[PDB]
């Protein structure tokens with residue numbers, strides 16, 4: 001018999017933070033022997 | 049004499065000769081973004097933040 005208007009809200013996620021990681025600053029930040037050893041176990045850093 | 053955190057790092061100490069305190073903070077370390085064109089001679093550098 002009688003009506004009204006109701007409102008609702010909805011949120012849908014469409015994005016995410018873009019995270020970038022490197023091999024040097026993570027494994028061999030400031031060590032030369034670390035780099036010399038990492039250069040022999042295969043890079044895998046190009047793949048990451 | 050020494051100040052530690054939950055991870056075991058050193059973030060402070062106390063001098064023995066002068067009996068004064070200090071704080072230890074890590075130094076800057078980061079990468080640089082370079083925008084390079086096909087037949088360019090030198091890319092454009094951007095030091096973020």
Ligand SMILES: *[C@@H]1O[C@H](CO)[C@@H](O)[C@H](O)[C@H]1NC(C)=O
Nearest residue numbers: 001002003004005006007008
């Ligand atoms: C419907 O509800 C509104 C707000 O309460 C009121 O102003 C109106 O008179 C009502 N209509 C009827 C037919 O009851």
